[PDB]
Amino acid sequence: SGFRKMAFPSGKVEGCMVQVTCGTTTLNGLWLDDVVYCPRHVICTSEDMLNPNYEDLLIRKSNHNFLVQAGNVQLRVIGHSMQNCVLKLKVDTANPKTPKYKFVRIQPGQTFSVLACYNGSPSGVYQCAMRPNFTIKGSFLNGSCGSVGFNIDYDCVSFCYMHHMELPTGVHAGTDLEGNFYGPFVDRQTAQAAGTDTTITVNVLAWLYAAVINGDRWFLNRFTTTLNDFNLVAMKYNYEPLTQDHVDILGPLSAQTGIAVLDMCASLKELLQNGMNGRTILGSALLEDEFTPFDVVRQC
Amino acid sequence: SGFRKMAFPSGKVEGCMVQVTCGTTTLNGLWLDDVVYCPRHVINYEDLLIRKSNHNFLVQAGNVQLRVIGHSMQNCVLKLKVDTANPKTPKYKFVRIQPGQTFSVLACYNGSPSGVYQCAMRPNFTIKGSFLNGSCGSVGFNIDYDCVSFCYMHHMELPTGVHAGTDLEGNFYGPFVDRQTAQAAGTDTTITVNVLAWLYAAVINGDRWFLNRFTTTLNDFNLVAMKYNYEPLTQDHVDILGPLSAQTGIAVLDMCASLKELLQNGMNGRTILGSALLEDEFTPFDVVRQCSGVTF
Ligand SMILES: CN(C)CCOc1ccc2c(NC(=O)Cc3cccc(Cl)c3)cncc2c1
Ligand SMILES: CN(C)CCOc1ccc2c(NC(=O)Cc3cccc(Cl)c3)cncc2c1
Ligand SMILES: [Cl-]
Question: B287 to chain A: which residues are within 8 Å by CB?
Answer: none
> Which of B171, B198, B183 lies closest to B273, judged by CA?
B198
Q: Classify residue A32 by its DSSP letter.
A: E
> Which of A177, A16, A12 lies closest to A103, judged by CA?
A177
Q: What share of chain B is helix, strand, coil (3-state, %, to 5)?
A: 25, 30, 45
In this structure, how many other beta carbons lie within 10 angstroms of the beta carbon of residue A67?
A: 14
Find the residue in B nearest to A16 (Cα): B11
Taking only Cα atoms into account, the Rg of chain A, rounded to an integer number of angstroms, comes to 22
Distances (CA, A) of B119 to B7, B137, B233, B265: 8, 16, 21, 28
All residues at 6 or more sequence positions from B185 whose CB lies less than 8 Å from its CB, including other chains? B122, B124, B125, B126, B158, B160, B162, B164, B174
Question: Hey, is B191 helix, strand or coil?
Answer: coil
Of all atoms in ligand 1, which is nearest to the CA of residue A140?
Answer: 25
Do the beta carbons of residue A66 and residue A80 sit within 8 Å?
Answer: yes
Looking at domain B15-90, does it have CATH number 2.40.10.10? Answer: yes
Instruction: Considering the candidates A41, A80, A163, A164, report the single residue annotated as catalytic.
Output: A41
Task: For ligand 1, say whether the CB of A187 is within 6 Å of any of its atoms.
Answer: yes
In this structure, how many other beta carbons lie within 10 angstroms of the beta carbon of residue A263?
A: 17
**Breaks in chain A follow which residues, C to N over 2.5 Å?**
none
The reply to whether B62 touches chain A by the CB within 8 Å rule is no
Judging by beta carbons within 10 Å of its beta carbon (0-12, 13-18, 19+), is residue B246 exposed, middle or buried? exposed
Task: For ligand 1, say whether the CB of A270 is within 6 Å of any of its atoms.
Answer: no
In DSSP terms, A69 is beta-bridged to A19, A74
Q: Which is it for strands A35-39 and B91-94: parallel, antiparallel or unpaired? A: unpaired
Handedness of CA B217, B218, B222, B223 (dihedral sign): negative
**Which residue has the CA at smallest separation from atom 21 of ligand 1?**
A187
Question: Hey, is B75 helix, strand or coil?
Answer: coil
Find the residue in A nearest to B8 (Cα): A124
Cα(B140)–Cα(B19) distance, integer angstroms? 17
Domains A15-99 and A198-300 share a fold: no
The yes-or-no answer on residue B136 being catalytic is: yes
Task: For ligand 1, say whether the CB of A49 is within 6 Å of any of its atoms.
Answer: yes
Q: Classify residue A65 by its DSSP letter.
A: G
Helices (DSSP H) in chain A: which residue ranges?
11-14, 54-59, 201-213, 227-236, 244-249, 251-257, 261-274, 293-299
Do the beta carbons of residue B84 and residue B176 sit within 8 Å?
Answer: no
Report the topology of domain A1-14+100-197. Thrombin, subunit H (2.40.10)
Report how this structure was experimentally obtained.
X-ray
Side chain identity at residue B94, one-letter code: F
Question: B128 to chain A: which residues are within 8 Å by CB?
Answer: 2, 4, 283
**Which residue has the CA at smallest separation from atom 21 of ligand 2?**
B178
Question: Hey, is B222 helix, strand or coil?
Answer: helix
Cα(B66)–Cα(B69) distance, integer angstroms? 9
Q: Which is it for strands B147-157 and B91-94: parallel, antiparallel or unpaired? A: parallel
Judging by beta carbons within 10 Å of its beta carbon (0-12, 13-18, 19+), is residue A258 exposed, middle or buried? exposed
The yes-or-no answer on residue B38 being catalytic is: no
Cα(B144)–Cα(B149) distance, integer angstroms? 7
Cα(B171)–Cα(A44) distance, integer angstroms? 55
The reply to whether A279 touches chain B by the CB within 8 Å rule is no
Cα(B144)–Cα(B123) distance, integer angstroms? 24
The reply to whether A138 touches chain B by the CB within 8 Å rule is yes
Do the beta carbons of residue A75 and residue A68 sit within 8 Å?
Answer: yes
Find the residue in A nearest to B206 (Cα): A170
Q: Which CATH code for domain B1-14+91-188? A: 2.40.10.10
Do the beta carbons of residue B171 and residue B95 sit within 8 Å?
Answer: no
Q: Which CATH code for domain A15-99? A: 2.40.10.10
CATH match for B189-292 among 1.10.1840.10, 3.40.50.150, 1.10.150.120, 1.10.760.10: 1.10.1840.10
Find the residue in A nearest to B201 (Cα): A139
Mutate to test the interface with B, among A10, A16, A169 (most CBs of B within 10 A): A10
User: Domain residue spans in chain A?
Assistant: 1-14+100-197, 15-99, 198-300
Cα(B46)–Cα(B40) distance, integer angstroms? 10
Cα(A159)–Cα(A111) distance, integer angstroms? 12
In this structure, how many other beta carbons lie within 10 angstroms of the beta carbon of residue B112?
A: 14
Judging by beta carbons within 10 Å of its beta carbon (0-12, 13-18, 19+), is residue A46 exposed, middle or buried? exposed
Question: A14 to chain B: which residues are within 8 Å by CB?
Answer: 9, 11
**Which residue has the CA at smallest separation from atom 10 of ligand 2?**
B133
Do the beta carbons of residue A90 and residue A139 sit within 8 Å?
Answer: no
> Are the beta carbons of B114 and A9 separated by less than 8 Å?
yes
Q: Classify residue A281 by its DSSP letter.
A: B
Class of domain A198-300: mainly alpha
Phi and psi torsions of B233, nearest 5°: -100, 125
Cα(A295)–Cα(B87) distance, integer angstroms? 33
Distance A142 CA to ligand 1 centre (A): 5
In DSSP terms, B79 is beta-bridged to B37, B72
Task: For ligand 1, say whether the CB of A131 is within 6 Å of any of its atoms.
Answer: no
Do the beta carbons of residue B80 and residue B19 sit within 8 Å?
Answer: no
In DSSP terms, B143 is beta-bridged to B148
Cα(B171)–Cα(B184) distance, integer angstroms? 18
Phi and psi torsions of A118, nearest 5°: -145, 125
User: Which of A3, A14, A137 is nearest residue B11 as measured by Cβ atoms?
Assistant: A14
